[PDB]
Symmetry: D2
Subunit: 116 residues, 4 copies
């Protein structure tokens, strides 16, 4: 599993469950092509987005649907979504965890990149 997304809720001190995530990859014509999508589990984690074969070098955008998350909980937040945009696999295959910590008016994101 070369791309994993983990989301935490800083208000409740819990995993952020059922957060929708959409991943895009920049195509040859410079548009954002849909690449993979899913939702976080009870642990706040989203596994199984892609495969080693499919996750080639490119520029990827991970869009974490934070507004949809807060509004499903009945809260009006500030951001539409969090966007994490990065070049992947340009020195060979790596494993990427994109972690996000959410509050209604703030979020932080970090990447943990490992070499198998």
């Amino acid at each position: 599993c070369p791309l994993m997304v983990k989301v935490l809720d800083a208000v409740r001190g819990s995993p952020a469950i059922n957060v929708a995530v959409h991943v895009f990859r920049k195509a040859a014509d410079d548009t954002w092509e849909p690449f993979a999508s899913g939702k976080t589990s009870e642990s706040g984690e989203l596994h199984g987005l892609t495969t080693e074969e499919e996750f080639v070098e490119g520029i990827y955008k991970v869009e974490i649907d934070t507004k949809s998350y807060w509004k499903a909980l009945g809260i009006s937040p500030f951001h539409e979504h969090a966007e994490v945009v990065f070049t992947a696999n340009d020195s060979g295959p790596r494993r990427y965890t994109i972690a996000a910590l959410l509050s209604p008016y703030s979020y932080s994101t970090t990447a943990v990149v490992t070499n198998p």
Copy 2:
């Protein structure tokens, strides 16, 4: 000044100076229309982006060119840029500060919205 952007460097403990910032407004066709731009000052702040007259309700994107900032310091960063996407609302308070705190493999953003 209804919109201000402030950028900070978590590695050196300093304002992030001379960082390019581009603001876009979402158009009716869902594309991003250039709206305003500038570079952060010696304080890490970018003032004067827009006016109350121009800054109507809608969805805006603030793009912060973090990659060039880190590379000009000789540091290899993870992200292409940082993006902050939000709705401007007239029911809320009138002044928006979008603050960003930068590290090579991480960034955070908060909104401080006041009258």
Copy 3:
């Protein structure tokens, strides 16, 4: 003003107003000696804590009374308080801003140190 403390609320997107802040200096016997204190203003800022003459090199602790802040808002928080412990150094730049960004179960802190 060699030391300023700024506190922000990540839940409401606002300055954190009327937050108690206590600063201590580490004494020769390793205890914490009261040094300065105050409450954040309407801007979330606390100015005037000390002077260049009083703020000598050494280890300081800034304690931010986050628990009372959240409870006054009717919110149950995780931490007793936030603590920031650091060394003041004359080799560095002269002005220290300790900024804190608060959520009920999380907080972050950065130092912005400038001339």
Copy 4:
């Protein structure tokens, strides 16, 4: 394992390995009594600090030795250590993960609290 500590490095995009952690508990006389200590593993995690029986209700301080971490890597950081101070188990036993994200002049900490 009712108390776990996880530390990440925001400069390198990696777990923060070999970070020393000291846990204290406020005693009846209001002093900080040493409670447990350890160091983060190759995954950035520290398991095995305490037991369900030993981890009674109280006020705990988790001291993450961030300066020692950065100085062992040859970097001069701003903070002496990160301190996370919280009441535990006052509504019955819970499981606590204290997560920290480190940069030389900044850190963030979050708690993930679950009910077995």
